[PDB]
Design a protein around this ligand. Sequence first.
Ligand SMILES: CN(C)c1ccc(N(Cc2cccc(Cl)c2)C(=O)Cn2nnc3ccccc32)cc1
Ligand SMILES: CN(C)c1ccc(N(Cc2cccc(Cl)c2)C(=O)Cn2nnc3ccccc32)cc1
Lengths: 304, 304
Amino acid sequence: SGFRKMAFPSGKVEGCMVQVTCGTTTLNGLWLDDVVYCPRHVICTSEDMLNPNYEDLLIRKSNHNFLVQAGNVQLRVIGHSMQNCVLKLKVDTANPKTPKYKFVRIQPGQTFSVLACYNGSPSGVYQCAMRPNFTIKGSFLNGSCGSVGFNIDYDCVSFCYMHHMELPTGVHAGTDLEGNFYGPFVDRQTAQAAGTDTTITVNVLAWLYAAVINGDRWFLNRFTTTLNDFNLVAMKYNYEPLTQDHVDILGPLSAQTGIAVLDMCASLKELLQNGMNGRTILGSALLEDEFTPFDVVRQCSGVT
Amino acid sequence: SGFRKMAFPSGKVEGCMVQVTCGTTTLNGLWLDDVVYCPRHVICTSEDMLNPNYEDLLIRKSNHNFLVQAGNVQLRVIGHSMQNCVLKLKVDTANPKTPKYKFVRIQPGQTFSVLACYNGSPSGVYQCAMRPNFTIKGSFLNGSCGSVGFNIDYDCVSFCYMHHMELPTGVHAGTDLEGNFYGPFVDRQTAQAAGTDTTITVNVLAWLYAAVINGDRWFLNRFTTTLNDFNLVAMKYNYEPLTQDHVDILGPLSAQTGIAVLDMCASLKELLQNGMNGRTILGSALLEDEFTPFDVVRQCSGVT
Ligand SMILES: CN(C)c1ccc(N(Cc2cccc(Cl)c2)C(=O)Cn2nnc3ccccc32)cc1
Ligand SMILES: CN(C)c1ccc(N(Cc2cccc(Cl)c2)C(=O)Cn2nnc3ccccc32)cc1
């Protein structure tokens, strides 16, 4: 028992982290096979970021201007192309540490692990989620750009995120591994409003199921609710609407605990209307939404 | 910016994880050089755990009874010995993935990353701390025994913990890599009272410094305090006493923010006496104590 904000083992991803330098800008790159993926803003100076024409700035760059260093050894750039907001640097050597991989674009509410890197070197690993407003509440400093977000299914690493920027509000924005930004964000230094940060309702419910599985049962009440009634309360508290798909997704946790999904909803409704009253759930004083139902089942069953 | 419960990259430790089977018991082992370290209770059945005589149970075991599997390949056991509550299985092959390593016994208040494993396979990685009562609030299931807690300083992995058991209260107990249990715990299935779980005061202060560095400043007040006055309040709230050593340890964070340690103490004193009032600090509704001053400086500076 015990419930932790658990990240995937980062080893498979550490072996892909490289350093990319273009001009005076140094950031991180992901080396899978003979291609190095990195944020296209590697070609910019901090002054270029105000109003960049990436296609124009790119014409002034050749293969020999992109310095790729894997560990302490230089890689040879034999090609370069821009795909949306990422650069694909073709190197002459396939990464001998390349895991089985997929590039997946995740939806808001989905969680993933981030391996924060500086100069191609992994600094740390933490678990976070794509917010309903397409930002991530990460921990990134200058030089972390090109750090990736990922999931693992046994041996296959599914890359879902690459870090690009910190919005003025301290939140983070990035792309999927095809260069497409999550949400309406652009790689331009202009104030971009993040949007309403709603709570991922299905994930809070999953986390209430994890709490019951792990012994924390104080919040369990004698009430039930309907999806329509619950959603009225959820709207009021800036919680995402709960759908019948979310109810089905919570089926396996509902079976394991014997608590019907709408009974757990009524419990959640009371926690929103009454508060925690100085109490905790899984050592937390707030309702946690960065654990999906798949994450709870995974952590509670011991998937490796 | 952004502050996350960040774990060390787990790659160096994943390459040391092996599966140890003795009789019908299967748990994890740490393979460094030609030695596999594992909990001595690998020789027990769940019935033996009630009243085990490890030295007696051990006489009935030979090298060929300890099945060590690294990935999908078996390792040859050429020796075995018991050191306190750990078994050292001498194998005929040195781990080719052995990192630079140290075995260190940590003090309460210190944090480390745990790589939760099942059958020698890493399942996840999370950051936790040795509590003042020598337990860890981990996330372990049956079969996780032998999972290790560690720190990294560039390339040297300092192993500090090996998981042994879950106390009836859902908390965890284990040893250092020399087989010595943290605290008064014994590898025997008898109810063991964990002891008072106090808050690591120096770590809460470090985390308040991280919040100021990351923009959360609402809790900053116009007051100061003395160590003696602060400790009166800290005692009342089951917080560890703050020493002059802790004040010195918070020096670099006090310099970086311009907030004197006793001014931050007065801020902490008010948070304890008044509560958060429905507000958050670094996205948390409670005072976080599982980040040391070294962890804050590390995460805020970008150590790789
Ligand atoms: C390449 N170049 C010199 C450069 C320089 C600065 C940036 N920016 C500013 C910026 C640009 C574009 C858009 C928006 Cl909203 C902000 C970042 O936000 C980069 N960044 N990412 N995570 C960070 C955490 C802390 C500090 C900086 C961080 C990008 C590129
Ligand atoms: C080898 N053998 C068959 C065996 C079987 C059971 C255990 N015990 C019981 C136990 C023994 C000793 C002391 C105390 Cl307080 C409890 C554990 O606590 C083992 N364990 N570790 N983390 C866990 C999380 C969930 C479930 C079990 C977990 C140890 C050894």
